[PDB]
Amino acid sequence: LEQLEDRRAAARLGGGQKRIDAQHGRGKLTARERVDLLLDEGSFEEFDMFVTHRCTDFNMQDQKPAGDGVVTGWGTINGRVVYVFSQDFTVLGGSVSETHSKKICKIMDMAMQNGAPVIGINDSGGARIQEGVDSLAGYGEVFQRNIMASGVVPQISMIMGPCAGGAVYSPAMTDFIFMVKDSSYMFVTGPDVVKTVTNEQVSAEELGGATTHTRKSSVADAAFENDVEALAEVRRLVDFLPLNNREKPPVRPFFDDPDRIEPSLDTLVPDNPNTPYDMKELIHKLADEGDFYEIQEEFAKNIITGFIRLEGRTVGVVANQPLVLAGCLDIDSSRKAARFVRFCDAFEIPLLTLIDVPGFLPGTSQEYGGVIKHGAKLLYAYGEATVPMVTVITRKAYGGAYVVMSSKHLRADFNYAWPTAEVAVMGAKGATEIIHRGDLGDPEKIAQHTADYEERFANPFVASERGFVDEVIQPRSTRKRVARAFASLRNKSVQMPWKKHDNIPL
Amino acid sequence: FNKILIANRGEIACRVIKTARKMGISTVAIYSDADKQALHVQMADEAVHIGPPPANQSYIVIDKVMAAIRATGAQAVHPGYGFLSENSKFAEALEAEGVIFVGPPKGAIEAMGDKITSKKIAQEANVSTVPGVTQPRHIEIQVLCDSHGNGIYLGERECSIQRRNQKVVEEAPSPFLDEATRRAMGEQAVALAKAVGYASAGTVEFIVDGQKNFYFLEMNTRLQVEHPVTELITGVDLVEQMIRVAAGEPLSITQGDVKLTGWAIENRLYAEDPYRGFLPSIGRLTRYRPPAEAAVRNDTGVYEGGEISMYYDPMIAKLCTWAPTRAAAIEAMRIALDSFEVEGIGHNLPFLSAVMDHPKFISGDMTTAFIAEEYPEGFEGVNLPETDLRRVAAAAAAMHRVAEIRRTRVSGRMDNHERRVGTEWVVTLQGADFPVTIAADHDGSTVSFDDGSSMRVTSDWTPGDQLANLMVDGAPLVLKVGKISGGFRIRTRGADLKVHVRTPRQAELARLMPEKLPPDTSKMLLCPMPGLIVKVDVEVGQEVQEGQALCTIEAMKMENILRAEKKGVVAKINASAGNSLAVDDVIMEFE
Numbered sequence A: 001l002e003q004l005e006d007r008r009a010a011a012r013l014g015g016g017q018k019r020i021d022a023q024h025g026r027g028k029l030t031a032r033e034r035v036d037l038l039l040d041e042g043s044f045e046e047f048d049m050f051v052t053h054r055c056t057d058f059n060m061q062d063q064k065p066a067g068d069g070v071v072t073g074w075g076t077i078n079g080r081v082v083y084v085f086s087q088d089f090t091v092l093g094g095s096v097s098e099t100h101s102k103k104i105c106k107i108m109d110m111a112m113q114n115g116a117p118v119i120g121i122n123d124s125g126g127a128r129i130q131e132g133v134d135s136l137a138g139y140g141e142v143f144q145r146n147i148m149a150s151g152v153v154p155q156i157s158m159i160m161g162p163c164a165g166g167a168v169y170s171p172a173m174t175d176f177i178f179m180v181k182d183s184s185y186m187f188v189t190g191p192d193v194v195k196t197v198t199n200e201q202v203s204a205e206e207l208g209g210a211t212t213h214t215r216k217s218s219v220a221d222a223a224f225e226n227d228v229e230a231l232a233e234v235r236r237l238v239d240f241l242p243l244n245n246r247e248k249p250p251v252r253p254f255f256d257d258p259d260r261i262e263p264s265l266d267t268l269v270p271d272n273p274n275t276p277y278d279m280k281e282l283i284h285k286l287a288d289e290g291d292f293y294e295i296q297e298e299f300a301k302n303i304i305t306g307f308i309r310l311e312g313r314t315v316g317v318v319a320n321q322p323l324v325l326a327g328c329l330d331i332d333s334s335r336k337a338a339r340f341v342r343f344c345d346a347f348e349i350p351l352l353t354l355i356d357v358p359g360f361l362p363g364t365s366q367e368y369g370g371v372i373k374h375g376a377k378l379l380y381a382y383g384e385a386t387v388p389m390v391t392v393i394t395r396k397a398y399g400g401a402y403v404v405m406s407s408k409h410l411r412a413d414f415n416y417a418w419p420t421a422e423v424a425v426m427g428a429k430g431a432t433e434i435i436h437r438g439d440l441g442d443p444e445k446i447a448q449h450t451a452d453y454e455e456r457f458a459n460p461f462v463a464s465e466r467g468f469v470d471e472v473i474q475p476r477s478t479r480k481r482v483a484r485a486f487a488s489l490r491n492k493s494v495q496m497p498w499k500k501h502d503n504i505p506l
Numbered sequence B: 001f002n003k004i005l006i007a008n009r010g011e012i013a014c015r016v017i018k019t020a021r022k023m024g025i026s027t028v029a030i031y032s033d034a035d036k037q038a039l040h041v042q043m044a045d046e047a048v049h050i051g052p053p054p055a056n057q058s059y060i061v062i063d064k065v066m067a068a069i070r071a072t073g074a075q076a077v078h079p080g081y082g083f084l085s086e087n088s089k090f091a092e093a094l095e096a097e098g099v100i101f102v103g104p105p106k107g108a109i110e111a112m113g114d115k116i117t118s119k120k121i122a123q124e125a126n127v128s129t130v131p132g133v134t135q136p137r138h139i140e141i142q143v144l145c146d147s148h149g150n151g152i153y154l155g156e157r158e159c160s161i162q163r164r165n166q167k168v169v170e171e172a173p174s175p176f177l178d179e180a181t182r183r184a185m186g187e188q189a190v191a192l193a194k195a196v197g198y199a200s201a202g203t204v205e206f207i208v209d210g211q212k213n214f215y216f217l218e219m220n221t222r223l224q225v226e227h228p229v230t231e232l233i234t235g236v237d238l239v240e241q242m243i244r245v246a247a248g249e250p251l252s253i254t255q256g257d258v259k260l261t262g263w264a265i266e267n268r269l270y271a272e273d274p275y276r277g278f279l280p281s282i283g284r285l286t287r288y289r290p291p292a293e294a295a296v297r298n299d300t301g302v303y304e305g306g307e308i309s310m311y312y313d314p315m316i317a318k319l320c321t322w323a324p325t326r327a328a329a330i331e332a333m334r335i336a337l338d339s340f341e342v343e344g345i346g347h348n349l350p351f352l353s354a355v356m357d358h359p360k361f362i363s364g365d366m367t368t369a370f371i372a373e374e375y376p377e378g379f380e381g382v383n384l385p386e387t388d389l390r391r392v393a394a395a396a397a398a399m400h401r402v403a404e405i406r407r408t409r410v411s412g413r414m415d416n417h418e419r420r421v422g423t424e425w426v427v428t429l430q431g432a433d434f435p436v437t438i439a440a441d442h443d444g445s446t447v448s449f450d451d452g453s454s455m456r457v458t459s460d461w462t463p464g465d466q467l468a469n470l471m472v473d474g475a476p477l478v479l480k481v482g483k484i485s486g487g488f489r490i491r492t493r494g495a496d497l498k499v500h501v502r503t504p505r506q507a508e509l510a511r512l513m514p515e516k517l518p519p520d521t522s523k524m525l526l527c528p529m530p531g532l533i534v535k536v537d538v539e540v541g542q543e544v545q546e547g548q549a550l551c552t553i554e555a556m557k558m559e560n561i562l563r564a565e566k567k568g569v570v571a572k573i574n575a576s577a578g579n580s581l582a583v584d585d586v587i588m589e590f591e
Ligand SMILES: *C(=O)CCCC[C@@H]1SC[C@@H]2NC(=O)N[C@@H]21
Pocket: A328, A358, A359, A360, A361, A362, B556, B557
């Protein structure tokens, strides 16, 4: 029946050609257009296209659009199956109803039964008020699903419009949150209530805009320039991820050599210890085709988390940034890396940790802020992780931080060190003042006591005599050392004690 | 002939060293602190410290030098240039030892050292002089004598193309002056030579005009940076002859012999950023990849992994080429540059490429104001002509597919439902769209455009290569590649543009995307880290480039460099060394 074709095409129109323009007006693509660019050209199969809500209050039953506000279904990304839902803002604001969620659950339930990621494209005005508790229940079934799938199948959230109220809590629980620079936002409570209750006046963009979230709240993993790159970068991300927790990181061709040498590296660590360098240089040189997909770049900049491949396989990476806060570990840097580590482990992605941390960032602000708990998270993450763990200390590895950064005591596999490494209880100075009290009144004793601690302990060799550093290597060969180190761990299998789940600090 | 020290460093040091040892001669060098790395150090058969990074404490200090010259046993020290190559004090201290300062006699040096004196010494020497000029062309002559009365010239080099008086491009011979006027300048050049008792090799700078009327500005008693050009057409090693003669010796060839074959062009790779008013650039060299072989010569004092310190000349390399015809050399050069890869610092590579493509450079019709006339607003960037955008479009399109196909070979794909790569694309270049179709087999790829035209792309390239050597329509196209969301960043000549390679619907929708507008900047530099101000390297009323180092706060035994947000001028400063500021404290203010 060409009648079918009509119904079909009718549905495809969403809230109508006038609203479609409105949407495009805000620089925002439509639900379907976003889906169209996300999935392998012509590979999308839509489900529940003619679903209509079951509301009867407030004359809601006189406006029963097809699809009920969200476009769901599946398709492929580079040939690999992926499940998706794109909220159609032009339809009843892409407001969440009993049936809108049901649609999302159908493909979440399908993603899980078949072991395939779920990409969520949120662009909604929020709950569908007229539905009452049914809107609440609608959220509930999504949340529950979101939770059960955590670490079982990758859940990438894409915010491309508004996201308010309970809603935020869903992407909150997914593995990644990407936002579109200016057209998107998200917050539990609206700017207007923030006023009537805080008397504070703030705009939606200020309150929960892409920027606010990619660098202040710690909620988004990146803010993309616009809808098109947003979609493009997400597939890029998906190309690294495994399809579920059973299989291991995907493999693909790679035009680079596992034995590549970067001599430039031999001088990356500056002579003067007070001069930074960009830890990211190292990352790119080690990374396969120099490709490095960074996560939460604009947040907790004193630490770097990202993905790279080696010999065409996915490797996660956590590394300290001297350029910021002197590579200190702090509540935020900790929370930022901690989760990255956990996601990579939950999904069999190995870890490469590049080290140069002085210690943790001092301060009343830190202590009152609970570094005792947040700081531990990253420690907890490496302690728990069982994927293959290779480490390279480029320079500073002092005290507690030293331990947290994938130390050998956290049962990492390879603990490499550049000759410029310095692993020790604390700096030569402080160390000395504690070890030699009755000697401070002799500024030449302590000037000499330090000079000895420095000459005897600030290096990687005392740690080597102990076995804590499996080897000290020539910087230029890092790429070669690390590549085969992982290669040899492809079979690694380690068992953690049985338990329903962990109790990591929150 | 044996243990000969070098009073210089950088590229020049290597320049000489590479010659000394090529004639079995015990090489020796010196080096400051921030120069233990330097390529010359490792090129010599010995090396001695000489103090801190500043040369007014290491390379100029005659005590230091000397102590080492004996410390390693002299025999013939060389000053290279621009240092003690022309400072009498050192010139005598050497004779006060027997160390043959290879070059000119401390007398003739002070001779042409003073304008007045020089003026006269050329007069009776019957040396032309601006009496008392139309198209001023800076054309110089390379002459070499010996302390045995003999002396000859080896052609002329035109360095008309110089910015702010700093030479940029030198060539040999000169596209202007002909045979007669050449020997004219040449015969008179060398004549002037003897007249002052010049020994080694030296240069005589003239100011030819519109009628081939040549005059004489001055003589530089030393080896010229731009000599390579002379060498690539004469078939001589000024550094060789330089020592030979500095070592009581005759000239193996006479004037009738000194022949000048084919052409030679020399560019200077300076660590300066054309895009930001040639502001010097400071930093480490991440990628540093020059060409190699129509000849290709690269004199460098740097390597990859090395750093360009504030304590010296921003020159990173001299990229010389040569061939039969001039048009030829300008070409090897143009290709040469295309493959020169530099990362980590700001440089003039694109600028050089630009002038090499500049018609006036091509026609040779250039004056000494050329730089000032043609680039009045600094380097405004370069932008490709249709047939260029076209060739590039096709290449990117061709490369993009290659990469895209690879994404397709991911493990774990639906058995009979893999992703199938498209044939239709839309390459968006310099504000220009190119709907294109691709068809490729095994040899290469065939890109066809709307107008029925089709180019054939052939290439070695593969993802990750930072440089791409393609063959589009049988003609060589060398590109510098970088990844970008919808395609790549391509750089060809002075070119440097985002080439988007999207599919028709991808392109169709991207067209709906808003046009990004940069953020706003406060004219107030707030201190972001509660630290101590280590140093301010900017003065009140100074002009700053976008991203220029302003001050430096010490965080937790770690230095952080703060830098200008956008180009602007310092209104006022309100903090100095030793100061300790909290967050937000205004460090400086801009007008
Ligand atoms: C030098 O100025 C005094 C030493 C400052 C201590 C630094 S601050 C951050 C590092 N971690 C730590 O606890 N101490 C180190």
